[PDB]
Design a protein around this ligand. Structure first.
Ligand code: NA
Ligand code: NA
Lengths: 157, 158
């Protein structure tokens, strides 16, 4: 188990383990605040030379953004982070789940697998598909603190 | 006007023309239909080394997609294309404007120019800002056909 660090911009990773390097692009949306929201955009390299942009699950968006409560305090309400076991990549969303998002609180970790669907019309060819949601053991100020609990048994089924 | 030649994937182009290469990513949304939806995603290189993802104007999205009337249609209702005049880049959206999208019809061309809005409250730092919309002078089956009318005079403000 490795959490996967990402460089600003293009990261060449082989998310679907087929020998062609894909892109994970790490960028931020700058709309002029102290803590711009970082977003991840996934592009799967196709053998025909095209790049297939992956959707956000349960969304019409194609970039996975972090979320912060307002312009102001330095903590995350929602975060995303990539993990890898051997050749397999997993995307994990950490989210503060209590009503008072400002306080130290419970955090849910949603584990997504890479899923290829080749088959049903109108379904994405390449998507992140939920495998497991767990509640972190500790309460935290910032969602990203929960990733310190992620281990091999939590990612796999 | 010949459009900007994009390769599939990352195109390293200096969109705001400040000397730092930015990314224009050409990709497709594959959703088990007869046609992929082609999309452009823009990332502006910042001095601190970060990349700033540009929003789609008047939208919650961050990729500019082409659009068809239905899964199997062999024409576009909406397209986007990059052009360049001297050092400036212009994003041009072609859209079929009539309710009856299936028939040959009027197409609009919305020209966007690059705009920086620095330290301005809650406004995107980097955006495509509408310069002008023009109605193409011929009616077309597919919106991308109207790019044949694009020229220097259409693109630049002065
Ligand atoms: Na790959
Ligand atoms: Na630039």
């Amino acid at each position: 188990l490795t959490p996967v660090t990402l460089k600003n911009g293009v990261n060449q990773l082989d998310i679907n383990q087929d020998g062609l390097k894909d892109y994970v692009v790490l960028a931020q949306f700058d709309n002029n605040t102290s803590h711009p929201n970082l977003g991840l955009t996934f592009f799967i390299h196709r053998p025909d030379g095209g790049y297939s942009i992956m959707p956000v699950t349960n969304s019409s968006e194609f970039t996975w953004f972090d979320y912060r409560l307002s312009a102001s305090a330095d903590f995350l309400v929602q975060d995303n982070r990539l993990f890898k076991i051997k050749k397999h990549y997993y995307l994990v969303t950490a989210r503060k789940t209590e009503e008072d998002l400002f306080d130290v609180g419970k955090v849910s970790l949603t584990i997504y697998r890479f899923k290829v669907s080749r088959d049903d019309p109108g379904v994405p060819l390449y998507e992140w598909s939920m495998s497991k949601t767990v509640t972190a053991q500790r309460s935290y100020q910032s969602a990203d603190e929960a990733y310190q609990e992620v281990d091999e048994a939590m990612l796999t089924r």
